[PDB]
């Protein structure tokens, strides 16, 4: 869910410093903007890149597809409460709302995570949300989000010898330190 | 200190004097017998104690009729007795019906005899386990009996020292479909797995059962075959 | 020892005497290894070789 | 038809002995409807006797992997299970032939999903021993140990295709020589491997002697290297690689480093076939240690030109960057004492009262700073 | 000894079922770092009436598998070999009779 | 005291680990059972194994 999006971050860096190609930001950035429902990756690059010739209409159809996904979410919030089950509102919108986080950087994040964090039946339910902060914390080099979610992972996600997504924590801290001034933390981790 | 003798059951277990005879069988000279697609191969392991003994006097592989082979793993002095019984019995069948006796019927009657010696209470059991084979009505057979009167039916089996080790080789090496020569090859292989180091044209003694009849091979063809068969 | 008969078969419950190892009698190539190792001190009259005995 | 089934082998052995690649390749492309005509039992024999006797001809890389692709595509067009597994095996053999980095592994991952459920327990290890080759080739030593353990627990059921017990023994020696811990065992492994290579597997037999005698040089018993190149089967299969072994053997027997380097460089084409030149340059190095030990005590009697450059047997003038490299990387704390004539080796390692007091201070005031919270807290 | 006015509660000890073997498995293996994609009821259904002695032994052989690798990571395949690591015989025949 | 006391002072039994003939079954497992857990105790910790009894 995040490999071409971390490649979009690679492209953020790749058209951050050099201007040796002023059309990667149309080539593989429009190829990114047609996949993943990448809306914000062109909506914030709409100013720092070129004039974007007429780039509203081929993006109008995809923000309309996003509108379709969002309106079936807005129906789903009361269609899932008629489903006589536990927290099916929470399930049925946490799925497509983590997908909203995949679409949009901060908005789907904020409107999703403060609802789907309300019950924590597993530390995966915390830590996928933590991952969906860590993706944007690599995209935008935050500090508060992507050290306080690691604080939350260093609150309760010590439990469970699952070891994959506990070593992910070590890898993210290694990436975060080597992302700033690391000597030893990335080697050790 | 019980059981003692042959007339009474144990407190919970079995007939210890039959168990000891089976152990005395398992402590005997090794043997192997394999049922192939067209024929059955028998092979024994016959070591002289000294260099003085002759290999032309006593014979392990032994025919009962012209088409029924029979080996053992145990004691010859009982082997010859029940051989003679099977001889006379098979000839009684051939008197009655004017037809060569089927091998299953041999195994029934020999098992009845051995069972009758396991009956009470002064005679001991045989210390002999047989391996009976024959080519009756197209399909060849292979029948193992035991001192307890029971009997079985095998594709390939072994009896004597390291019958377990030879059996684990037989399960791995052998299969259902081979010819008689490949059967002899794997038979000398599984006997060479467990026998002593000097295996010659005389230490082994091999008889086969074609559908054309029983055949007891000579040291000539045994030396031709085992001239480093593998 | 090779005698588990004055030994209780409750000593073979996993938790007490767990590791089952039974040693090979001889085998091949440890005739080579041990035929080499015992000759570490005896002085080996120069062609009297020991592969024949392996 | 049946009389043409011998002509497949007849014309194909003609094209393998005397013919060339494109003609036999046209024959394999030509017998594709003939296998459709004949019964599908001895068809695997046709696949073996054509593909093996075509790929054992000559390296022509535009046809080897491409006809392997032909075997894949026809085996996935006809879609049976038992034929194509040997095709998988020969393909990953071809991938080992050029030491392929990912695709051998990514095909063996497709092999393991199919073999450990079927009947042939030996066909697993028939390619897992090749994986043990390629993980020794990429130096995945733990996974090589894992594959050897799987091979040892596989070979406890059946005797094998005739000479792979020998192949398992050679590669057991390979894993035991990758550790460089136990060598006599690996020597026995190669030795039984070559006895399993008796008159039937010559191109592995020739390097079997290389492995066993290279081990016996590694073993530091050169007398038996002499006595066993004097053995009868060594004199049955003598040649040039045994000349390399004998010259390196005498050079190790007398420890002449010049003889060693000399006859080392003389036979470079046979010197590649041991990828462990580290044993050789470690006999160089691990002899040079005690040579510079007897030449670091010899200095203080009557020393010469530089005392630090050319006491070392006067090879040319600059055989070092070895001794200096062992002041560099390793040490015996010999500081460069160029103009004295001893090269004095000195230090005082117990000084650790001062060290220990430093380690005290570091935590003594951690305590004091932890107490300062109480000190500046309970007042105001 | 067995006077009921002398011994007042005699409770039996059954060898466990699938759920209880699963529970004992969880108990011992909770400190064992099990990787991911690892099912445990399958291991419980690989147990044909395991008393609880060998239930500990399966986990110790899994730890030994992790020890022979220089690893600290245990897959379910380790248990797939560890169940196989326990089988003894009592093979012999020409003794069926009965 | 124990048979004299605690590996009775001077007595190496003088049977080399190298003198053992290729017991890659025996030496490896006995090494893991006794010779290893005195040294790499933290791996038994880190996997949580509860090392074998005997």
From Swiss-Prot, chain B:
Protein's GO biological process: proteasome-mediated ubiquitin-dependent protein catabolic process; response to virus
Taxonomic superkingdom: Eukaryota
UniProt cross-references to Gene3D superfamilies, sorted A to Z: Glutamine Phosphoribosylpyrophosphate, subunit 1, domain 1 (3.60.20.10)
Modified residues (N6-acetyllysine): 66, 167
GO cellular component: cytoplasm; cytosol; extracellular exosome; extracellular region; ficolin-1-rich granule lumen; nucleoplasm; nucleus; P-body
CDD domains on file: proteasome_alpha_type_2 (cd03750)
Keyword line: Acetylation, Cytoplasm, Nucleus, Phosphoprotein, Proteasome
Induction pattern: Down-regulated by antioxidants BO-653 and probucol. Down-regulated in response to enterovirus 71 (EV71) infection (at protein level).
Post-translational modification: Phosphorylated on tyrosine residues; which may be important for nuclear import.
Record carries keyword Nucleus: yes
Residues the record lists as Phosphotyrosine modifications: 2, 20, 72, 117
Family annotation (PROSITE patterns): PROTEASOME_ALPHA_1 (PS00388), PROTEASOME_ALPHA_2 (PS51475)
Subunit structure, interactors included: The 26S proteasome consists of a 20S proteasome core and two 19S regulatory subunits. The 20S proteasome core is a barrel-shaped complex made of 28 subunits that are arranged in four stacked rings. The two outer rings are each formed by seven alpha subunits, and the two inner rings are formed by seven beta subunits. The proteolytic activity is exerted by three beta-subunits PSMB5, PSMB6 and PSMB7.
Name under which the protein is recorded: Proteasome subunit alpha type-2
Underlying gene: PSMA2
Swiss-Prot record, chain C:
Subcellular location: Cytoplasm; Nucleus
Source taxon at top rank: Eukaryota
Residues annotated as signal peptide: none
Job description of the protein: Component of the 26S proteasome, a multiprotein complex involved in the ATP-dependent degradation of ubiquitinated proteins. This complex plays a key role in the maintenance of protein homeostasis by removing misfolded or damaged proteins, which could impair cellular functions, and by removing proteins whose functions are no longer required. Therefore, the proteasome participates in numerous cellular processes, including cell cycle progression, apoptosis, or DNA damage repair.
Quaternary assembly: Component of the 19S proteasome regulatory particle complex. The 26S proteasome consists of a 20S core particle (CP) and two 19S regulatory subunits (RP). The regulatory particle is made of a lid composed of 9 subunits, a base containing 6 ATPases including PSMC4 and few additional components. Interacts with NR1I3. Interacts with PAAF1. Interacts with TRIM5. Interacts with ZFAND1.
Family recorded in the similarity comment: Belongs to the AAA ATPase family.
Protein name: 26S proteasome regulatory subunit 6B
Organism: Homo sapiens
Name of the encoding gene: PSMC4
Included stretch of the parent chain: 311 to 364 of 418
Curated annotation (Swiss-Prot), chain D:
Keywords: Acetylation, Cytoplasm, Isopeptide bond, Nucleus, Phosphoprotein, Proteasome, Ubl conjugation
Stated induction or repression of this protein's expression: By FOXO4; expression in embryonic stem cells (ESCs) is mediated by FOXO4.
Keyword Phosphoprotein in annotation: yes
Compartments in which it is found: Nucleus; Cytoplasm, Cytosol
SMART domains: PAM, PINT
Gene3D superfamilies from the UniProt entry: 1.25.40.570
Post-translational modification: Phosphorylated by AMPK.
Tissues expressed in: Highly expressed in embryonic stem cells (ESCs). Expression decreases as ESCs differentiate.
Any GO BP annotation: proteasome-mediated ubiquitin-dependent protein catabolic process
Cross-referenced Pfam families: PCI, RPN6_C_helix, RPN6_N
First-listed, main subcellular location of the protein, grouped into a coarse class: nucleus
Highest rank taxon of the organism: Eukaryota
Gene Ontology cellular component list: cytosol; extracellular region; ficolin-1-rich granule lumen; membrane; nucleoplasm; nucleus; proteasome accessory complex; proteasome complex
PANTHER family hit by this protein: 26S PROTEASOME NON-ATPASE REGULATORY SUBUNIT 11/COP9 SIGNALOSOME COMPLEX SUBUNIT 2 (PTHR10678)
Family statement drawn from the similarity comment of this UniProt entry: Belongs to the proteasome subunit S9 family.
Self-association state and partner proteins as the record states: Component of the 19S proteasome regulatory particle complex. The 26S proteasome consists of a 20S core particle (CP) and two 19S regulatory subunits (RP). The regulatory particle is made of a lid composed of 9 subunits including PSMD11, a base containing 6 ATPases and few additional components.
Protein name: 26S proteasome non-ATPase regulatory subunit 11
Species name: Homo sapiens (Human)
Curated annotation (Swiss-Prot), chain E:
Lineage: Eukaryota, Metazoa, Chordata, Craniata, Vertebrata
Residue pairs linked by disulfide bridges in the UniProt entry: none
Subunit annotation: Component of the 19S proteasome regulatory particle complex. The 26S proteasome consists of a 20S core particle (CP) and two 19S regulatory subunits (RP). The regulatory particle is made of a lid composed of 9 subunits, a base containing 6 ATPases including PSMC5 and few additional components. Component of a complex with USP49 and RUVBL1. Interacts with PRPF19. Interacts with TRIM5. Interacts with NDC80. Interacts with PAAF1. Interacts, in vitro, with the thyroid hormone receptor (in a thyroid hormone T3-dependent manner) and with retinoid X receptor (RXR). Interacts with ERCC6.
Source organism of this protein record: Homo sapiens
Superkingdom, natural source: Eukaryota
Protein family: Belongs to the AAA ATPase family.
Protein name: 26S proteasome regulatory subunit 8
Compartments reported by the entry: Cytoplasm; Nucleus
Function field: Component of the 26S proteasome, a multiprotein complex involved in the ATP-dependent degradation of ubiquitinated proteins. This complex plays a key role in the maintenance of protein homeostasis by removing misfolded or damaged proteins, which could impair cellular functions, and by removing proteins whose functions are no longer required. Therefore, the proteasome participates in numerous cellular processes, including cell cycle progression, apoptosis, or DNA damage repair.
């Amino acid at each position: 869910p995040k490999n071409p999006d971390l490649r979009i971050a690679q492209l953020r860096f790749l058209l951050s410093l050099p201007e040796h190609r002023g059309d990667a930001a149309v080539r593989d950035e429009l190829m990114a903007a047609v996949r993943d429902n990448n809306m914000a990756p062109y909506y914030e690059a709409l100013c720092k890149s070129l004039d974007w010739q007429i780039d509203v209409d081929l993006l109008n159809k995809m923000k309309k597809a996003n509108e379709d996904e969002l309106k079936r979410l807005d129906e789903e919030l009361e269609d899932a409460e008629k489903n006589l089950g536990e927290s099916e509102i929470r399930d049925a919108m946490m799925a497509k709302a983590e997908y909203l986080c995949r679409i949009g950087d901060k908005e789907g994040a904020l409107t999703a995570f403060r609802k789907t964090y309300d019950k924590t039946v597993a530390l995966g339910h915390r830590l996928d949300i933590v991952f969906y902060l860590l993706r944007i914390g690599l995209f935008y080099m935050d500090n508060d989000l992507i050290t306080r979610n690691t604080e939350k992972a260093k609150s309760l996600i010590e439990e469970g010898g699952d070891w994959d997504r506990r070593n992910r924590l070590k890898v993210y801290q290694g990436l975060y330190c080597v992302a700033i001034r690391d000597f030893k933390q990335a080697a050790e981790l | 200190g019980y059981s003692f003798s042959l007339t009474t059951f144990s407190p919970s277990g079995k007939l210890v004097q039959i168990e000891y005879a089976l152990a005395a069988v398992a402590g005997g000279a090794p043997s192997v017998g394999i049922k192939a697609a067209n024929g059955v191969v028998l092979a024994t392991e016959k070591k002289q104690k000294s260099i003085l003994y002759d290999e032309r006097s006593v014979h392990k592989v032994e025919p009962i009729t012209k088409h029924i082979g029979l080996v053992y793993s145990g004691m010859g002095p009982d082997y010859r007795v029940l051989v003679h019984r099977a001889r006379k019995l098979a000839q009684q069948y051939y008197l009655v019906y004017q037809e060569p006796i089927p091998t299953a019927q041999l195994v029934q009657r020999v098992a009845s005899v051995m069972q009758e010696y396991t009956q009470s209470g002064g005679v001991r059991p045989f210390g002999v386990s047989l391996l009976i084979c024959g080519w009756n009505e197209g399909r060849p057979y292979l029948f193992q009996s035991d001192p307890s009167g029971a009997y079985f039916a095998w594709k390939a089996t072994a009896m004597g020292k390291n019958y377990v080790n030879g059996k684990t080789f037989l399960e791995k090496r052998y299969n259902e479909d081979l010819e008689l020569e490949d059967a002899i090859h794997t038979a000398i292989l599984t006997l060479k797995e467990s026998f002593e180091g000097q295996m010659t044209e005389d230490n082994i003694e091999v008889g086969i059962c074609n559908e054309a009849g029983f055949r007891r091979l000579t040291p000539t063809e045994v030396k031709d075959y085992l001239a480093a068969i593998a | 020892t090779n005698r588990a008969d004055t030994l209780d078969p409750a000593l073979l419950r996993p938790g007490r005497l767990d590791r089952k190892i039974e040693f090979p009698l001889p085998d091949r190539r440890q005739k080579r290894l041990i035929f080499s190792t015992i000759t570490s001190k005896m002085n080996l009259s120069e062609e009297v070789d020991l592969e024949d005995y392996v | 038809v049946q009389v043409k089934e011998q002509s497949i082998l007849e014309l194909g052995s003609l094209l393998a002995k005397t013919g060339q690649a494109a003609e036999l390749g046209g024959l394999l492309k030509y017998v594709r409807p003939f296998l459709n005509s004949i019964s599908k039992a001895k068809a695997a024999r046709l696949v073996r006797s054509l593909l093996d006797l075509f790929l054992d001809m000559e390296a022509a890389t535009g046809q080897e992997v491409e006809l392997c692709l032909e075997c894949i595509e026809w085996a996935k067009s006809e879609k049976r299970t038992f034929l194509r597994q040997a095709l998988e095996a020969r393909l990953v053999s071809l991938y080992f032939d050029t030491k392929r980095y990912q695709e051998a592994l990514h095909l063996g991952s497709q092999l393991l999903r199919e073999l450990k459920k079927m009947d042939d327990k030996a066909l697993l290890v028939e390619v897992q021993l090749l994986e043990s080759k390629t993980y020794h080739a990429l130096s995945n030593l733990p996974k090589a140990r894992a594959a050897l353990t799987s091979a040892r627990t596989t070979a406890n059921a059946i005797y094998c295709p005739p000479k792979l017990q020998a192949t398992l023994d050679m590669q057991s020696g390979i894993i035991h020589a990758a550790e460089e811990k136990d060598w006599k065992t690996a020597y026995s492994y190669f030795y039984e491997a070559f006895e399993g290579y008796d008159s039937i597997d010559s191109p592995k037999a020739i390097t079997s002697l290389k492995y066993m005698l290279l081990c016996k040089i590694m073993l530091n018993t050169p007398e038996d290297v002499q006595a066993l190149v004097s053995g009868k089967l060594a004199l049955r299969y003598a040649g040039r690689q045994t000349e390399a072994l004998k010259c390196v053997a005498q050079a190790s027997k007398n420890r002449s480093l010049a003889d060693f380097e000399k006859a080392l460089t003389d036979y470079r084409a046979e010197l590649r076939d041991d990828p462990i030149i580290s044993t050789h340059l470690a006999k160089l190095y691990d002899n040079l240690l005690e040579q510079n030990l007897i030449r670091v005590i010899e200095p203080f009697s009557r020393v010469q030109i530089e005392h630090i450059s050319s006491l070392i047997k006067l090879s040319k003038a600059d055989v070092e960057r070895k001794l200096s490299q062992m002041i560099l990387d390793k040490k015996f704390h010999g500081i460069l004492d160029q103009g004295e004539g001893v090269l004095i080796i000195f230090d005082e390692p117990p000084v650790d009262k001062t060290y220990e007091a430093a380690l005290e201070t570091i935590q003594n005031m951690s305590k004091v700073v932890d107490s300062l919270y109480n000190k500046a807290k309970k007042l105001t | 000894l067995l006077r009921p006015g002398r011994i007042d509660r005699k409770i039996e000890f059954p060898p466990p079922n699938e759920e209880a073997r699963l529970d004992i498995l969880k108990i011992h293996s909770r400190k064992m770092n099990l990787t991911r994609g690892i099912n445990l009821r399958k291991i419980a259904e690989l147990m044909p009436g395991a008393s609880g002695a060998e239930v500990k032994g399966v986990c110790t052989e899994a730890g030994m598998y992790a020890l022979r690798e220089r690893r600290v990571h245990v897959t379910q395949e380790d248990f797939e070999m560890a169940v196989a690591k326990v089988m003894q015989k009592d093979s012999e025949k020409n003794m069926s009779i009965k | 005291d124990s048979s004299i006391m605690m590996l009775t002072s001077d007595q190496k039994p003088d049977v080399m680990y190298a003198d053992i003939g290729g017991m890659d079954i025996q030496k490896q497992e006995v090494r893991e059972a006794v010779e290893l857990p005195l040294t790499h105790f933290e791996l038994y910790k880190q996997i949580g194994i509860d090392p074998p009894r005997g």
